[PDB]
Amino acid sequence: TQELGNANFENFIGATEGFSEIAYQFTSHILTLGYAVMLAGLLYFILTIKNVDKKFQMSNILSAVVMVSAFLLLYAQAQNWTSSFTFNEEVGRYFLDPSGDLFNNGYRYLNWLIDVPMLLFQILFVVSLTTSKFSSVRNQFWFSGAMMIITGYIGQFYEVSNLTAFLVWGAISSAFFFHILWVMKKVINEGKEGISPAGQKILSNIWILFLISWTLYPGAYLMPYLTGVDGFLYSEDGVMARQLVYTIADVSSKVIYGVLLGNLAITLSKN
């Protein structure tokens, strides 16, 4: 039995095969880029709040708060990665360090728990609904989004120990994800009514961005099993891939999403 690498697939690899210098350093630098971009975004959203009418500024405020939480928690995740493995001169690879704290997904999942409700909420300060009620949409978003992250978090505890449960819990989580997609699509359709064609075009881009960037997360969750129980991805390569797809998803769903909403708000105050 491999006691030290039971908690997650990153630990499992690091306690059996170990990581190449390339995989270790690559992952270290990708995660560093992750939190560095959130700090830049924090400054962008603060400095541009004066460019939008007061009625839309709650969206820029919620983007700045998402940036603070993501900078701090991705910074923690980055330090956790680099401090958890150490180099063995004999084998020439990085292995899980029993004296360290071991790699822990808690930082990222906590970041999601906080940010998902705010990302979904903030669009309701830019578009107008038509036949739907603000409170009803808000409550559906907050409930479904919380459940999606919780059931997902439960799933990842069984990643190494019980793949069957890993997949069943991820399927449950996917149910909530599809309900979010259904609600967001109705919101975008109602928000397109009555606004200018320029604004409708930006909203269409927001919808495509939202759909792709959020679908990246379940992809990264499954990444090391996407080539079978002993394929190319069941390895340090599935780890590099998973961590890269999370970082791309985070920049897109938090920073780029917020920039587009700010551009929509500016467009709206032109008619």
Ligand SMILES: *C/C=C(C)/C=C/C=C(C)/C=C/C1=C(C)CCCC1(C)C
């Ligand atoms: C800024 C962080 C964001 C927007 C996080 C989004 C997270 C998700 C869409 C997570 C989705 C999941 C599934 C649909 C199934 C597998 C488990 C999750 C939690 C990764």
